[PDB]
Amino acid sequence: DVNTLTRFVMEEGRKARGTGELTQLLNSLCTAVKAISSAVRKAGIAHLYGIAGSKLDVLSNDLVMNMLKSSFATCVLVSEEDKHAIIVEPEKRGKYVVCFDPLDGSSNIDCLVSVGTIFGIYRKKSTDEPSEKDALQPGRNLVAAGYALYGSATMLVLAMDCGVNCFMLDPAIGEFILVDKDVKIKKKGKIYSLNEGYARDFDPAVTEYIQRKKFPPDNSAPYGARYVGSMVADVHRTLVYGGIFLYPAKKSPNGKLRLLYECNPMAYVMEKAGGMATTGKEAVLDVIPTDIHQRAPVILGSPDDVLEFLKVYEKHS
Template structure:
């Protein structure tokens, strides 16, 4: 791009020129972006800022929190609570919703976020990130309750993530494709570096935690085994496996060059439909993937059609290049069919 376009200019054009977003949503997204810059600074300081290591506490999921988990959560709340754009927030790190304090004006949007995805990678200097999703508060609803957040992913009005790696990159959709913005540290602003992102429908890369293979359901084993058989197998091509253990990093790779990411249900905890959270991870990532021409399912149905019933609901996730996700989904549906009677 000969002329660099800032995030602010991009959002103004989405609002004023293309009519995709109202002004309040534009302002909200700018605040989220500023919070991501603050988190990026804390991440980059690492040991110099005393932010590495655990915090001797657990989140609502029973997971040990890292210091940066807590810092990122606080940064997002403090940045967003006073602007007048939000009615409430929900975070993977908090048990219930966070109501905007009465001393601040109340807005019409609901913000959900995973403040720092990929926490296991914090101390080893591997890419991590922040994921966010924006919903519209139901019209005429008095106050805000947890039920107001129970909206299918298809009702999102904005979603994105910021990956903190060699570059800090903000990836965003407002329902008009996917755009990527790189943080220019000299100017202190995000600038547009890619737009109209498209995921190729076919791929030779898959991402999954292979150490769990013995626990997978048969459709997942079938798909991965076919990939491992390479050119001599039914797929007729060699596959590479990639696994960063950070959803942000794995999805960013897929948006950049294609691939398939899978975090399926497994037999270790059969009562849980999956590991990842529907509201904080699967919905925003699923919408980004779809907006880039890919596909996202839970192995059987479109993720964005799932009706949430709990704030911290978990789900199985298969997303990425369309033809590969369709194949995995087909294998699940075939396995669900009753065996023919004798």
């Protein structure tokens, strides 16, 4: 039988005998994702160029903000686009915190590069009046997380306690069809992904690890290199094909990517798929944040590859 995301998530919910708020949250999120996709693929563009005789990341944030508010399942919302946490109006408060990046990679959307939407969902932990502090949770607290990728097709990857499930958007009917069930990452890969133009500023251990991916001491074949420049695309490739992804800490002692709505959701997808994710000093999911836009270094992928990076990292520490 064909299965959709809303049919999938309804059935886990019922079986957990819950209140329905998480299902309503994810439904609002799907409706947002479909709206973002239709605009990313430029559905309205002829009118902008004058067929009737006469902002993407802003619009994406607007979509995601309003759909989650309208779901009655949230109380605190943290977005890459907003300086402060948005507090949901009293009459619409539900019980979840949502940290998201509504259109990651769109810095370079000029070249029609792959972009995406990243989210992680926390159960509000305190009875207190909702505030920014309700988002300062370690990622090990997540009840759900994942991303939508607007690549050659549009796909939603949702991880939960039951595992990682991939849904393809069928744009002719507006339905997210379940196409890959309970996925698992290869225990060792053959690709490495990072920006080697920063090589002059590399941590000494990053330099050495990469140098071993190109010049293996042991007569194994070198790894191939891929780096789209957009995180949802580089991570999704690592899920599907295996390997390692690096945005590590030398200047930038904390990395460049943001912990709440980039590093933690991807670290959570990775671990539920049988993979790893480190800062180099601890698991990404074990960092306790003190600021909603704070940064974290991130290294994730197949577990044999991450463990190997850590081997070399520790030889330099």
